[PDB]
Every structure is written in structure tokens, then in C-alpha cells.
Amino acid sequence: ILPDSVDWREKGCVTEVKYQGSCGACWAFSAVGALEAQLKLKTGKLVSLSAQNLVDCSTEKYGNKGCNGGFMTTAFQYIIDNKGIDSDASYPYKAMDQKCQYDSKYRAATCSKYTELPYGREDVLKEAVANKGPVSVGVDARHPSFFLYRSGVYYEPSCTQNVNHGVLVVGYGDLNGKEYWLVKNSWGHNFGEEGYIRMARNKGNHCGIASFPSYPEI
């Protein structure tokens, strides 16, 4: 039995919404967001982790292209291989590709492994969000409606399961009979509901939200 609604922000496991700017680092923000929650659950401290560290260091060897895109899963593996990721405070976000400047003296978190959920299973995603924590996911954000979203439960008739934008599911619930996934984006506070978007849930893997979900563990 799972709770009807979940919001990890109530549990103090979600940091301030970030602004990626003109740099395509959504994948990096998605990954650090997921790990930030695990760090809070393990140490009791909520700390924004360095998305820049991922953009600059989890590069070619991880199939990523910095400001031109990347994978949340390979980002997690980089953190594992590297034995750490720096804090955002020590390695600030500059919205541009830079030479890797990771330094263990600024390490704020570690990762031991990550898990990728089965393709398109929203019930499994619900279970992970309820029992494990925020989950990194990709969504189809190639439609105007996504950019113009302001409030309520987002539903786009033209959405597909071909995902291109990395975000973070930090909860789920329902608005007047309409089920949704609570998603943290990285487009600043002017986007949607002050940085968040509630996307249609249990509507046939709408916009591919449950297509490629993953979460790290410490």
C-alpha cells in the first residue's frame, strides 16, 4: 500500500530551484537533485550539489556533451567512479562548458550505485518516489505547451514517449480527480509553478515521464 500523495519538499529533501540558462545542463541538475535528497536522508543536511562539476567532468568518457546534453545515469556513474562530487557552493554553476576543476577537498557527497526503473511502468515509479526518494526522469518537452505552462496538471495531446529533457520527480498527487507527478525543472522560478510542473500521471506514460527513471544511493 502506497500513500495517495507524496511531496519530498515537505521532508526537507529538495533544494532551491536552479536556473540552467542557455546551457543544456538539465541532465546535470536532474542528477544532483536526486542525489541531494539521498544526501539529506543519510546525513541530515540539505546541500545543493555542483551541477557544473558534472558538466565539466562527466564528459566524453561518460557519453555526455556538457551544455549540449547528457545522461543522468552516466552522471551518477561518474560520481561513483570519481569517488565524489563537489558542493555547488565550492564549484558554482556558470552555464558554460569548462575544464574539469573537481577537487576532493570540496567533496560534498558520494554515490555507491544507481538504479534504472523498468521502462514505462508508472506504478513502479510511484513506489520508488514513495519509498526511495526523488527520481530522475526524462520527458518530452518539445511542445510549446510545455514552455507556456503556468499551472495545474499538464497534459499535451501531441506528447510522445521520445524524451529529451531531464527533470526530477519529487512527488505525486491529484488535483480535483486529475492525477499528477510533481516535477522539479531547472529553468528558474519563473517557469511554471515557481520552478515546478505537475504532469499527467497514469495517462499512458504521458510525455514519457516513466520511460527512463533512475535514482542514486549513497
Ligand X SMILES: *C(#N)C1([N]C(=O)[C]([C]S(=O)(=O)[C][C]2[C][C]C(=O)[N]2)[N][C](C2=[C][C]=C(F)[C]=[C]2)C(F)(F)F)[C][C]1
Which residues of the shown chain bind ligand X in the complex (CB under 6 A)? 24-27, 64-65, 68-71, 138, 163-166, 212
Q: Measured from the CB atom, is 39 or 163 closer to ligand X? A: 163
Q: What share of the chain is helix, strand, coil (3-state, %, to 5)?
A: 30, 25, 45
Segments of the chain assigned E as strands: 6-7, 85-86, 107-109, 113-116, 135-139, 153-154, 165-175, 178-184, 196-200, 214-217
Active-site residue identified among 53, 64, 82, 185: 185
- Are 47 and 23 in contact, with CB atoms under 8 Å apart? no
Active-site residue identified among 26, 67, 111, 207: 26
Q: Measured from the CB atom, is 15 or 73 closer to ligand X? A: 73
Residue 202 is a catalytic residue: no
CB of 167 to ligand X, least distance (A): 7
Residue 165 is a catalytic residue: yes
Residue 53 is a catalytic residue: no
Active-site residue identified among 13, 165, 205, 207: 165
Q: Measured from the CB atom, is 69 or 152 closer to ligand X? A: 69
Cα end-to-end span (Å), the chain: 26
Task: Please count the residues of the chain.
Answer: 218
Active-site residue list: 26, 165, 185
